[PDB]
Structure formats: structure tokens, C-alpha cells
Design a protein around this ligand. Structure first.
Ligand SMILES: [Ca+2]
Length: 124
């Protein structure tokens, strides 16, 4: 569920998702339109696309299971649809971590919709 995604961003990237990734660029936040603006924004675009392709369960409310071992987040449980939500969230938390070199809140926080024209919307 979304609370577990916040948790994975805190564990993996050592940052709050609600503080640093809830209104950044065109896609980090609910929905999105336009071009991914930089690497962190493309991590958000891929996470949107990933949630968009989960069929069988609900990425917002279902609770998934995971363990930490061999130095990684390991998605588990007996339900394959809930394991795919977990995989979407794990991938995005790692992408954020790996792209901290480029993160630029000064330029991309609250970017604004004319900068994200609906005619430049990249398809998943
Ligand atoms: Ca989004």
C-alpha cells in the first residue's frame, strides 16, 4: 500500500518520499503529464507505469510482504499480484537512491502544468 512504499523509500533511499518526492517534476506525485524532466522524474514515471500495469489487485490499498536479506529488499508472500506491487515500489526506491546525485529541488519542486504539456506526454 502507499504507506509501505513510503517505508521502502525511507529504508532504501534514507529520505521521506512525502517530503522529497510528492510534487517534483512532471510525474513525482499523483498522476502526471508531459516529459519526464530528469532521472528522478523518470523513476516516478516508471513507477506510475508499473502501477498502471498491475491487474488483479490494488497498489494503493493492498498490503504486501517483504524481508530484508543478502543486503536487499526481498518481495515475498504467496500472492503473485501483491508481489508485483512490491516489485514496483522496490524498483522506484532503488531508482531514487541511485539518482540522488542529480536531485534538484530548486529547479523541479512544484514545476507546474504548462511546463508539462499534455501533448508531450510520453506513453509507457
Ligand atoms: Ca505520478
Amino acid at each position: 500500500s502507499l504507506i509501505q512504499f513510503e517505508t521502502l523509500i525511507m529504508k532504501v533511499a534514507k529520505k521521506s518520499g512525502m517530503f522529497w518526492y510528492s510534487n517534483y517534476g512532471c510525474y513525482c506525485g499523483w498522476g502526471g503529464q508531459g516529459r519526464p524532466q530528469d532521472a528522478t522524474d523518470r523513476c516516478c514515471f516508471v513507477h506510475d507505469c508499473c502501477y498502471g500495469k498491475v491487474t488483479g489487485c490494488d497498489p494503493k490499498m493492498d498490503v504486501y510482504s517483504f524481508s530484508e536479506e543478502n543486503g536487499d529488499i526481498v518481495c515475498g508472500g504467496d500472492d503473485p499480484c501483491k508481489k508485483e506491487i512490491c516489485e514496483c515500489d522496490r524498483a522506484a526506491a532503488i531508482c531514487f537512491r541511485d539518482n540522488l546525485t542529480l536531485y534538484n529541488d530548486k529547479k523541479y519542486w512544484a514545476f507546474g502544468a504548462k511546463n508539462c504539456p499534455q501533448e508531450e506526454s510520453e506513453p509507457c
